[PDB]
Amino acid sequence: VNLRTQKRLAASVLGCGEGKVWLDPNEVSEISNANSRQSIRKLVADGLIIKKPVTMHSRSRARELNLARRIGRHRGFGKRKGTADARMPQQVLWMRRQRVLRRLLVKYRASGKIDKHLYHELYHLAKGNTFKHKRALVEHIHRAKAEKARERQIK
Amino acid sequence: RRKTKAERNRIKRRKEEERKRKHEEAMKRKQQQLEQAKKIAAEVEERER
Amino acid sequence: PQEVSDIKKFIEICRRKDASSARIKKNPKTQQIKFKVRCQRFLYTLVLKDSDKAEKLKQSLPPNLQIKDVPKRNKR
Amino acid sequence: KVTKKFIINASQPASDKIFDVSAFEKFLNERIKVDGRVGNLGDVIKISQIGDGKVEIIAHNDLSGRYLKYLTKKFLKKMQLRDWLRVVATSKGVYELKFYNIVND
Amino acid sequence: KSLKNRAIIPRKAVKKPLSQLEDHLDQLGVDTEAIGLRARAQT
């Protein structure tokens, strides 16, 4: 008995590949009598034809390695294969830093901590790479404020 | 003067509140017409006549 | 498909000559009722909260217009 | 404080003396963990019998019926009933143990 | 188990033989005649 047609029809009805189709090996003649999609659906309802579940592909090891890399493992010189710029672009780092500094300067000017002249000067210093990060820019702003306060107290 | 982020967020919250109020008022108008449905049907039939 | 928000316009649509049929869809999970009238170009849907007056809107609907309730299963 | 309620209905294998409800209660008491620790039930989770082969679980934390089904399947595998008894959710919060479908031969 | 190459067929999709169920319950020590497994089994 040949059941190629029944396997193809059952794959089409179940919406899976033919490798996921299970035909009952004890009901071979009854399945062989099924020549229509209606008969295939009837056999699927009776359980003579079932769809096998998918083969396992778990992500547990990948998630465990991700947690280990997040806490800082497997980051050594024996694990790096690309260049430092290939791993982390200096252009991306500079763009992030410039956006952080400009965002902070906009916030300070809008809140009134700095005025517009100091904003312009700090903008061009930040573009000219004076400040390594937000903390350095904030300390520079505080030092400039202290110098201005001392000048106002002296004058 | 230049407005701050808090003022901009307040303006945005006001606009969203206005839109929500308009939607609720439209729903209540629809409910009132649903209460007055029979008179509305009588008026439509009279206009057709 | 078009939403109708005005009860008067929905009544005029239901009294239009090309209104062939109408149906009532009850959505109890969202507690709402939908009156759908089939016309020539468009299907017009009116959405209401489910209530007694939402039921009596069917009485104000025209009698010659066939009105059916939508069942839970759409049998082909 | 929210309270969630769970029923494990093993009435029918309990009547056939295949499933031991007292041993299942002991297993649940020793295996249900709160904040990752077994033996940390306290007043958060209460396990009891309401008779007719049924186990009653009261939880005040976010205990899940999927976790209760997982522990029931673990108990069935331990008692060598996993290949013959099935845990099916019959209603909301109620998991019932029944036989798989049997063919006469 | 062959989980590397294929998935296990679910137990609810396979009919369980009454003779095998009776033998396993008898080995576990359950009086199968006292519970009447014959009337339960479908044909």
Next chain:
RNA sequence: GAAGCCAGAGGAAACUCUGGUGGAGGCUCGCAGCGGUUCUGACGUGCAAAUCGAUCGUCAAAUCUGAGCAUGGGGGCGAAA
């Protein structure tokens, strides 16, 4: 890592130095593709009237490619053999 641009330090200024930024090139390593250097290579009435393996050249352009169309033997086309 070319022009352009920012900052700092000098210089009377022109300019000079330092740190960034930028992203140029018939530039370069290299995957596909395209090509065809080498091997006492395989094959030698072969899988093949030119194929197979390893290796190699090139890889953002004078790069690769389909269809439509044009040039016809005293001819055409030819980075010319």
Next chain:
RNA sequence: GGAGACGACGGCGGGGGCCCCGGGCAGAGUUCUCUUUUCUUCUUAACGGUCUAUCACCCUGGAAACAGUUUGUCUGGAGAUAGGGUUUAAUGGCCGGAAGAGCCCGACACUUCUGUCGGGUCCGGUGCGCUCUCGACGUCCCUUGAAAAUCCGCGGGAGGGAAUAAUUCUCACGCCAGGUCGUACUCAUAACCGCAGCAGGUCCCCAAGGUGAACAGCCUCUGGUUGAUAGAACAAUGUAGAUAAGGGAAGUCGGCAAAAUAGAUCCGUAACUUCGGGAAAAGGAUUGGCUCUAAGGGUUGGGCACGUGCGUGCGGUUAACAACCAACUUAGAACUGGUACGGACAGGGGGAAUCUGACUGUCUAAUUAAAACAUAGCAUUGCG
């Protein structure tokens, strides 16, 4: 007059889809031990409505103590900033479509005919990710990167137009109509060409997870195959893949072949030079696992006095503070295994010179890839 209608490349920003993470219901697998576990469904079309979305444009006003501002230095008295608006642009949010569908699960019935009935289909997060698309920029050219059918807007004011009412309204709804072919299947280690079911050749989209810089190599999921005459034995000589003590090119025409090198971090790098290069020159130090430390972000949020959640008049820049949220890099330290730590895979041997062609490129399809050809540059001749 606009659309049709237009190059290549670079980075940046928005959106869909994919990938990834957390919770929840339902089902499945594992269960000596462990694992609140691992896996599967959890979807939303065209067409419309509504509210929004960079550029740009408008109004007020008049800027040096110049300001605004992109990753990329452009913009502004030819009117910036600021404040308030108007608009091109949806594959964005909500609603209709539309849950009635599809999908998942359960309980009964069932010789077949046939099914029937319940429950659910939910809420978030992330990004130098992949792919498509949109936008604003920028670079290059002695190269400036189609046409037509077709559609619309405007200028003009010819005609046509009212109270016997008129209407020649690109508004809504309504009425009628839409002919002819082509549509199976393959698109290739068997459907095409090569005399064949020939290891050759033959144009495209769509493209998951892990490792890793990476559509490299290696392993896996969905989906496909398991097709290429088979069984037994293990001689010589082969083809393909390997190892070899001591010596280290003594071999051979000739180091042919093989071996050695190789990723990444750090130190360091000569002569010569057309100043651009040479250069990864050369020559060195390191790399596993575990447990920690440090650094690099986002969002929201200010006191009074009156009118009444908004308007003024003030007042203050230690919010330099709190609350909540989030990801991947980089540096430093201890401990620990070791014959190996780019543990497989992947992956420059290097140097001193000579001749030679400037370079990139091209040709003898099927024995020659080159000092041959071309090339930019240079020079001559002819032509108004």
